Symmetry: D2
């Protein structure tokens, strides 16, 4: 009766110390598991922030690309437009000279003035 | 009279000849210029097309690198989301097993030990 | 006297015609050279502005290259850091498991020491 | 005396067995996680290489295209010189031809006046 109670008290105190040994070692493993999770969680949050900066950086240069691209197309067509222009100018020059040369054949007007000088000459004689 | 008309006609010739001789010189100057000019302009049309084609390629190369740029951003963000998924599953699993535990089965076998020491005593 | 007068009259009218026709030509020549030079100088500039944009592209291409290189570098740092964290975790468990398995200070020996005490405590008052 | 020592030793061994089996379960989870984790890192490390290989290949195709762009800009300048030269020589030739035509003694007006002056002399001579 009494012996049986005293041995129940001591079992409950040993049981308590046996738990605490188990708990202490599981608490220590938990602080490692947690400390490991925070460092691991902070590295992915940093990487996420890094991808954010990465994408914001790439987006500016996408707009910068665009402005140069419209300017780059305009300069291209002007380079070919100028060139057509000088071809046009040369072709109108050459044609306006051919046109002149045609009236040269008409003039070889001289013979008219000589026939007139000859008429005056004979009239004298 | 005949002697006059003859004289006028030989003179008329020599004057028309001086003129045309002088015209032909310039018109041969004109002709060789046009030809040389139009020949160089024509290969130049080609060269300037080539120019515009290299500038066109350099422009496609940027479009290719921005594609890769965005492809790299998508695959990082997916790898990163999957790393985080495995980790959170692992943490939840440990949290699950901890919550389950152990201290009762200790108390059970201590009861059994007590039972046999009461029995023996 | 009459014949010489009308000969010099004709000569002058002849020299003028030659001269007019020459002035027309030389007017076309100089008008053409003038335009030609104005449009070539202008072409020299537009060509030189094309180089400018083609050069700004190169600098934007190179700019993105560096950024592309920089992400790569950072990613490899981010990976090197989370590998170092993980392996520091893993070895930290190994060393915790090492102390718990200790023949004289680990948890099984501390259990046995409690069981050692309880059993003599119970035997003492019972017998 | 003997009955209690062997009863206590059997229970030591049972408890330590309770301990071990839960420890083995946790170490099972830690190992399965470590494998899966070191698996996605090696894929990430492959990912890193594949974009560098894409980066590097584009960089070298870009320098090649810029070199060809620069050899096309040099050609624009050579074409410019040639056409400038050809026009310069045309004008300069035009000028030389008009001086020679405007020479006082041998120009084309003084050939027009010489021809004219013979003709006038042919006419007068005979009429006398």
């Amino acid at each position: 009766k009494r012996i049986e109670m005293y041995t129940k008290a001591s079992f409950k105190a040993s049981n308590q110390k046996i738990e605490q040994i188990w708990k202490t070692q599981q608490e220590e493993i938990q602080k490692l598991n947690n400390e490991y999770s925070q460092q691991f969680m902070n590295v992915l949050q940093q990487w996420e922030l890094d991808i954010q900066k990465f994408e914001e950086q790439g987006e500016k240069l996408s707009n910068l690309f665009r402005q140069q691209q419209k300017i780059f197309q305009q300069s291209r067509i002007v380079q070919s437009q100028r060139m057509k222009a000088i071809k046009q100018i040369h072709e109108q020059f050459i044609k306006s000279l051919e046109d002149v040369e045609k009236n040269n054949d008409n003039l070889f007007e001289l013979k008219k003035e000589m026939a007139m000088l000859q008429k005056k000459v004979m009239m004298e004689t």
